[PDB]
Amino acid sequence: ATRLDRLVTILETGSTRLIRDTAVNQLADWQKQHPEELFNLLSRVVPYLRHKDWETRTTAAKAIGKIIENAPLYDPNNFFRLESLDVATIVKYGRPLLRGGPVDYNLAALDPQKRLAHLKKTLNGRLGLLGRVFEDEEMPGAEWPFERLCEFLKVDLFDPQWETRHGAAMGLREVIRVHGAGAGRRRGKTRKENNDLNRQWLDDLAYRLLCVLMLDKFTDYSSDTSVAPIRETVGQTLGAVLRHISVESVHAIYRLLYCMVTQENMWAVCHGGMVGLRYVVAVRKDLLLQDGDMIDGVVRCVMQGLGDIDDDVRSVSAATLIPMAKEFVMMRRSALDSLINIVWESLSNLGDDLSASTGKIMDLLATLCSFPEVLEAMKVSASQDEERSFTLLVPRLYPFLRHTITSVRLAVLKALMTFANLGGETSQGWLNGRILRLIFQNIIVERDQDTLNMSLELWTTLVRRLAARDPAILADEFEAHAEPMMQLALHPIGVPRHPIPMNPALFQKPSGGTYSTHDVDGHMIQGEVDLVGVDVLIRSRISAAKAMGLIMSFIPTPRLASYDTAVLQALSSPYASTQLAAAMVIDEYAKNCSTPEVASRFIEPLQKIIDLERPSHYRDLVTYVQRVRSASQQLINLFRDHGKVSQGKLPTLAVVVQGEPEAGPGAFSIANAEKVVNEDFERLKRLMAPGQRLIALPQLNEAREQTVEVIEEAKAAKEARDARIKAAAACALVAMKVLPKKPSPLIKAIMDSIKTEENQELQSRSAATIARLVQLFTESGRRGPAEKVVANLVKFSCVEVAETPEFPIHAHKTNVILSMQKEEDRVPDAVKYAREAKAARITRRGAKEALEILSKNFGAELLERVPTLRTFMEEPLVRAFSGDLPPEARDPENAFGQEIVDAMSVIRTMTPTLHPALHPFVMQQVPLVIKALRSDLSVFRYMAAKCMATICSVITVDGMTALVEKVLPSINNPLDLSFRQGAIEVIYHLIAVMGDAILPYVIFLIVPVLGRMSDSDNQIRLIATTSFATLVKLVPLEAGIPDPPGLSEELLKGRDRERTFIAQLLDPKKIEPFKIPVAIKAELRSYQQEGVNWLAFLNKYHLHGILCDDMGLGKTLQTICIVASDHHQRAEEFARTGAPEVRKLPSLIICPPTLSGHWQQEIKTYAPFLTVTAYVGSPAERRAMKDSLDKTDIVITSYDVCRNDIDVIEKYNWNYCVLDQGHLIKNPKAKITLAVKRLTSNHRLILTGTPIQNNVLELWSLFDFLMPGFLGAEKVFLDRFAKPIANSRYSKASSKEQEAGALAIEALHKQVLPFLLRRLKEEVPKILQNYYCDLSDLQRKLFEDFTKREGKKITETAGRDDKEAKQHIFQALQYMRKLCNSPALVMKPGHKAYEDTQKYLAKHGTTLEDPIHAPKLGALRDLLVDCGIGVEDPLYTPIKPHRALIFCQMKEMLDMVQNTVLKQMLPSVSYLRLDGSVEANKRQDIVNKFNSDPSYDVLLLTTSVGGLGLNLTGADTVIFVEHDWNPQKDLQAMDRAHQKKVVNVYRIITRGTLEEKILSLQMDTDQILDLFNLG
């Protein structure tokens, strides 16, 4: 179908959210550009409000919201009375609205308005306005635009089908939200007349809305989100009406809602009334706060609802009071004390498993407990009554600890925190072992990190407040729960596809019994490693050990005998997960003791783990070993079936594997499988015939390597467990200050974790340990092992090649910028190259954090306590950059080169976390790094730029001052290439390190960056252009940019040339006017001169952009202005300075071959002082001017002759280079695209009506011609922009991939926006215009042949005024006016020159119907592509801005226009044709489709049918191909067949013919005779 039908149908079948939301923005954009198509888009999304699917109704209601926002508000300068509403009659006599099964077919087939007129009679009865229950056998721009629509919605509010009532309520919500004020008004009345007419209409809707709250009994028990889907929604619609009605109408709605709550019960009427009151306080809280009578009644309603039996009534009641919980506490402290215990009463009846709706009750209690006033009034009631003591109330919060909503579980821990920080007299009846167990259970099973943090923070205060009383009391309350809680802290963790479930009987409910929108903690209690991340289970054992470690540090040691037996037993457990957790509990116990000697009884069991050998198997890794046996067996079974080997020679594998329970010492192990692939694969290969081996060995080698894959997979899995347990035991020893005599094995255990540990929390613990171990050694001599540890950390922070280059690999590179290589090289993908690179990133991550923690432990004493660090960072730079570079530093075999690289690698690794007292040491090294930026070796310049950028981001005062004073001023220097490459590179890495923090410092960066895009070195141009693109992306468009804090006041003074640039770049309306210095013959409009200001701004700062002005605004003139002015201005400065950058060079204008004459004509008209060469013609003609093109000011060239003669055109240098329809360059691989990019030009422009289509790669190719590096190379552009965009558009894409693809669209549009000048023709009388085209060779031949015969008699019959003489002259003019359109109109069989013409067409090898002989056909496709109509899915393609009418006089011409232009040339255009041949009945059909479906681009028709009174509205442009002798007969048929917008009228006229002469003349004999002369 059409675009609009396919675009709307996506609302139903949008597979992802991104695909559905993209369709609603297309419809919203379609309304924004074509505001008159409002009721064509709405009449297709409104039917989707009755859809049987929930999301389709939601999406369709969303589109109505977006489409209506793009409609102008309506200011024109049978109703219901809200007061006369009786609650008793409607509830009693009304129609209960239920889930609707019945469908009455007799009504369904009625006229859509007769169906509506019938439902408006039945409505008064169904509402109960009669004294009886109504039964359906009694009855078997002048005004508001949406008033006809709202009748269908207000009537469908009571349809038996609950799906229809759902969509009708959402539709009314979106219409009244944007357009609520104008409803009801009618043109022809004063403000006071339709202000109350609006009040009556809004009261009429509120009347109907309250009825739905009373009558709707529908309830969906399936989902826990919404219980009353219609009452929840129709109350949301009531909120949109409240923000538009008077204060008196609100107080009337308030009383009617008050009767529904305090019914003077019934669940539905009480709930629906509360829902309405919920939005009254959330929308009109201002009006509610003066009238104290409303404040009392709305609070009386909440309190009754808060004590109601049903849970859903208490939820909406609590959600009503939250927005004014602060406001109600202050104003009425008398009612404050009664509100507290009623809220507390609501939580008392609840069990442990709470519905998702009950979460709003907790939100109400949490906001009340955040006020000190409420906390005091509770203590007064606690000292007075026993039933309000904290022992009976607080445990009512425990069922909320494991609530389904994530935000509720955090609000409870924050609330329970408030009670622990309240009093000692107050909070001890509830603070016991019962709450300690629930919190410890919360630590094991909580998945959210913020909630797990508060659980540990509450566990600390709960333990410390209870240990302050007596350490024996704390140990008694927890002794009853200590035994099972230990089994959960030491519980093993499984492998993906091998979950180790926890015993659910070890979890006590708040009810007291054990476990034996639900299943909140079952995924983790089951231990699903795939469903919940492997790192989430690990950080739940870490949190367990940290909790269990703190509680043990307070219990007296003699009563910890049961705890030690559990952990000593766990150190020898067959589960590696348990041994790791066991050693971590000992660690956190020794950390929290006052002295480390208290825990010194664990020294011997832990030193066993370090010194003894590790077990060769673990029970948690049994799945890996079982997987190894399968591969080993299939490898052997293949040695039997595929290769013919006897069963007796085959080895036998054990059926049970090691680590399994009840596994003998002869079970299957990894060592057995290593013997199968290493020694039995060889032994069994000797037992094959040399003929059998040749056929079977292919598939055997494949089976062998698949086995080794799993073998090395299991061995790596076990060695990871050996390192985890050894490192955890060593860290606990370091906590007990265990400094061995021979510390090599202790240090190795901690180091092996820092090298290889995928998990960050386990690695960060080992980094913090090795940082304290360095401090413990330097605090007691032992500088031997202390300086070897720090030296390894420094070595490990340089292994990631992405951060620290390998010097011998790049040692030979000079005059190269490695920053460009690093990104143009990572776009390599091999499994064993990405695994080794992953190990390097892990090793650096650990070592970097160890030095970070080391720098914070020693503070400002880091360089005095650890003097080896100062040597690594300072010594190599002093040797190499104090004076001349030693020749040793250039050799890749010498280690000196890498020592210099590592030195600067450590500086940027530790500068951020360095104590501010060590910044002078870094500043001492700055003169050495600047010396490296100037170096000739590129790898030194690369690291110097990364290092300096980091230093400037930390020491923002002196670091920036050094860069602006010592580096930036010498980017101009044309003698030292190496310093320029280094200085632009430190700018590149400065923007990358700081990010959007670079904003205040962009002042100092902008001029060196801009000027470097105009540099002789190609690499500096590219990296400066990429830098400039990142700046445009990172600026705040709407806000200003502050000044650099703390810098010199004299640095910011002389930099005002750089502030006017940034101001003009953000806002294009602040561009300085440009007085054209050449004598141009033109009246420049407000926008034309404004557009020339934009082109001069680009020329001034060496920028390039696209001129996207809509057709008619005159893009050709604005370009001739700027190129004539530029040639003049650079003719003056070349006379002043003679610099090569302003030498005389010709400009180049590339256009489609049809527009070659159009440019040549308008330069002749507006700028007659510019000499023009037209390098277009036959290959023979082009070769004369081929060698002489620089001898003029402008050179015009077609895209076709630019490919064949590119070797000629690139031999020249060009000033300007304009592309008249530049979208032909969008193909990056096209030959025309590559030829245009081989040109050396100074200033570039692109002229298009459409800048981009659906693809983003089209946009890259255009911007790659303008500013080469602006979007990067093609491969780096396909990565950051094209890959995520294409992935989010996948039918089944991830929710992360959707936002990754949406952030890229938004970022790509921001980089390219300041370089596209897109001014609409309409927003900021119909315009006639002439489109000129040139005659063809055949037309000139046929005109000359006519005047040779007929021209003799034309002189006779010209001024006769005779009878048949005026008939001969007229039909002689008809022959010419037909020939001006197409030669095929006049060259028909029977003509005297037919046989001669066919010879001419044959000698040149063409046909008569060839479109090149009728230039009006070619001029029509160019006029259509300049209006965005024709281009060379409805979803991703943009909305076309115009629709056209195309008029012709003859039916034969329309066939050419149809079969040639719209079928061969522009096949993507949707069109309809209208002839007098078509039936007068069928022609009315397609005229309707043109006004009902706005996706018809063009309507072809002849001027005969246009005068038939048919009226069209969607037309925006009108084109005339053929013309009548009376030029107003064309004006009649146009207006007769046709306002808000402006209409563009185009006359296609061949220059030099009678068309240019007839249309000019507004008859004398000699003036008639001149119609037969060309020119």
Side-chain angles (χ1 to χ4, degrees), residues 942-953:
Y942 173 77
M943 191 54 104
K946 292 177 60 174
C947 183
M948 181 65 62
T950 289
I951 297 178
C952 296
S953 69

Side-chain angles (χ1 to χ4, degrees), residues 82 150 154 157 169 171-181 183 198-210 233-247 249-250 253 276 279-280 283-284 287:
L82 186 66
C150 283
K154 296 187 300 180
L157 282 177
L172 286 177
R173 185 194 62 238
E174 303 289 352
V175 175
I176 304 299
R177 178 184 53 82
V178 191
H179 289 187
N198 166 268
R199 185 196 181 278
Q200 294 180 356
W201 195 97
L202 285 173
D203 287 26
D204 175 32
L205 181 59
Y207 180 99
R208 280 182 167 94
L209 292 187
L210 299 180
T233 300
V234 72
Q236 181 180 347
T237 302
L238 186 64
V241 180
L242 291 172
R243 62 179 296 262
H244 291 301
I245 52 183
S246 56
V247 298
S249 187
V250 178
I253 298 179
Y279 296 94
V280 174
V283 174
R284 302 296 303 276
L287 171 62

Side-chain angles (χ1 to χ4, degrees), residues 635 638-639 642 677 681-682 685 688 693-709:
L635 171 62
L638 207 58
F639 267 94
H642 207 276
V677 295
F681 179 87
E682 297 285 346
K685 212 174 65 178
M688 290 179 172
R693 183 189 315 170
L694 184 57
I695 301 187
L697 202 51
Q699 204 167 350
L700 260 51
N701 292 318
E702 177 174 333
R704 181 191 191 273
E705 301 302 326
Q706 293 177 218
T707 305
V708 187
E709 288 175 0

Side-chain angles (χ1 to χ4, degrees), residues 1473-1538:
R1473 77 166 315 178
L1474 278 167
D1475 307 313
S1477 158
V1478 188
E1479 283 271 346
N1481 186 82
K1482 184 192 280 189
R1483 72 169 180 83
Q1484 189 57 39
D1485 169 41
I1486 55 191
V1487 166
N1488 293 324
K1489 287 187 299 183
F1490 189 77
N1491 285 329
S1492 77
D1493 194 315
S1495 60
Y1496 289 108
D1497 293 308
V1498 183
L1499 175 61
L1500 255 53
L1501 58 93
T1502 180
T1503 63
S1504 306
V1505 198
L1508 264 52
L1510 62 96
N1511 281 285
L1512 308 163
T1513 50
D1516 187 32
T1517 296
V1518 171
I1519 311 180
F1520 283 96
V1521 182
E1522 298 203 333
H1523 315 306
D1524 205 274
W1525 290 271
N1526 181 218
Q1528 76 176 5
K1529 291 184 179 182
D1530 300 325
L1531 305 178
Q1532 287 181 2
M1534 170 188 57
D1535 192 280
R1536 196 155 305 156
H1538 215 298

Side-chain angles (χ1 to χ4, degrees), residues 30 44 67 119 171 257 299 306 413 443 497 525 588 754 757 875 922 930 947 1111 1164 1274 1300 1379 1477 1482 1569:
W30 207 328
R44 298 181 182 183
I67 292 178
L119 290 178
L257 283 171
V299 164
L306 271 173
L413 301 172
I443 289 178
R497 299 170 182 83
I525 287 175
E588 295 292 334
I754 297 186
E757 181 65 50
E875 168 190 319
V922 176
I930 298 177
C947 183
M1111 178 48 181
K1164 194 85 162 301
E1274 188 177 358
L1379 180 53
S1477 158
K1482 184 192 280 189
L1569 279 171

Side-chain angles (χ1 to χ4, degrees), residues 123-139:
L123 177 52
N124 291 326
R126 292 176 302 183
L127 283 180
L129 302 182
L130 304 174
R132 62 188 183 275
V133 287
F134 183 88
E135 300 173 352
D136 281 341
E137 286 76 8
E138 305 187 23
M139 300 180 181

Side-chain angles (χ1 to χ4, degrees), residues 744-1045:
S744 302
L746 180 76
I747 297 176
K748 185 186 188 306
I750 311 176
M751 282 301 198
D752 282 12
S753 179
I754 297 186
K755 287 200 224 64
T756 62
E757 181 65 50
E758 297 194 27
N759 180 260
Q760 179 145 36
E761 295 209 10
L762 295 182
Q763 188 178 28
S764 294
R765 293 170 63 94
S766 302
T769 296
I770 205 68
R772 182 166 177 263
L773 193 64
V774 167
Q775 195 171 36
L776 289 182
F777 284 167
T778 53
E779 275 182 355
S780 63
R782 285 179 174 265
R783 292 233 156 172
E787 292 184 349
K788 292 188 181 66
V789 165
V790 185
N792 280 18
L793 294 181
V794 174
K795 172 177 169 293
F796 289 167
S797 61
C798 307
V799 193
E800 184 179 355
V801 196
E803 299 295 332
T804 305
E806 293 186 357
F807 177 81
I809 303 299
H810 322 279
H812 62 277
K813 301 179 182 181
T814 66
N815 295 331
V816 186
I817 297 187
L818 283 186
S819 302
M820 293 291 92
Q821 283 198 10
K822 288 290 184 177
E823 63 172 353
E824 275 191 2
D825 195 16
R826 70 172 175 95
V827 296
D829 301 331
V831 54
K832 301 203 177 64
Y833 289 74
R835 260 203 293 264
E836 191 76 20
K838 178 191 180 64
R841 299 195 307 268
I842 295 175
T843 302
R844 169 161 192 274
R845 182 183 64 177
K848 179 178 182 296
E849 184 172 6
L851 303 170
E852 282 181 346
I853 298 184
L854 193 64
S855 176
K856 280 173 285 187
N857 283 1
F858 286 90
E861 305 267 339
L862 180 69
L863 295 188
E864 303 169 347
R865 292 282 195 276
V866 189
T868 319
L869 276 183
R870 177 156 185 163
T871 286
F872 279 111
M873 291 178 289
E874 186 184 40
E875 168 190 319
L877 304 180
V878 175
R879 279 203 62 198
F881 303 101
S882 298
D884 296 315
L885 186 68
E888 179 176 341
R890 300 178 182 269
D891 203 281
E893 280 289 323
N894 275 265
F896 190 21
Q898 194 74 50
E899 295 180 10
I900 305 167
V901 170
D902 295 340
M904 286 180 285
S905 185
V906 181
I907 294 182
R908 80 184 298 263
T909 301
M910 287 174 40
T911 302
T913 62
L914 214 63
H915 191 283
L918 296 186
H919 288 182
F921 164 77
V922 176
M923 294 308 301
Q924 184 176 329
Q925 319 301 323
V926 158
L928 303 180
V929 181
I930 298 177
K931 183 70 171 307
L933 278 181
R934 198 156 44 203
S935 168
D936 47 41
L937 289 191
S938 67
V939 64
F940 289 158
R941 290 192 274 103
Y942 173 77
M943 191 54 104
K946 292 177 60 174
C947 183
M948 181 65 62
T950 289
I951 297 178
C952 296
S953 69
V954 172
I955 305 96
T956 61
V957 181
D958 285 333
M960 287 297 308
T961 303
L963 182 69
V964 182
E965 290 180 352
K966 311 285 172 49
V967 183
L968 296 187
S970 296
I971 311 191
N972 298 277
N973 185 28
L975 307 183
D976 194 18
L977 171 65
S978 48
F979 191 78
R980 282 151 51 201
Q981 296 175 306
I984 194 63
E985 192 172 357
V986 65
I987 298 179
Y988 170 84
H989 292 287
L990 192 61
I991 311 174
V993 163
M994 304 192 64
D996 57 340
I998 200 69
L999 287 178
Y1001 310 99
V1002 181
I1003 305 298
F1004 312 97
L1005 267 50
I1006 186 60
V1007 160
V1009 162
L1010 289 170
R1012 277 321 93 201
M1013 295 186 289
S1014 303
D1015 187 12
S1016 62
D1017 191 43
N1018 194 35
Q1019 278 193 303
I1020 302 186
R1021 292 196 302 266
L1022 301 184
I1023 187 166
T1025 318
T1026 299
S1027 305
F1028 180 67
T1030 311
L1031 287 181
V1032 173
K1033 164 195 127 192
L1034 289 177
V1035 290
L1037 175 58
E1038 86 280 25
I1041 310 179
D1043 297 346

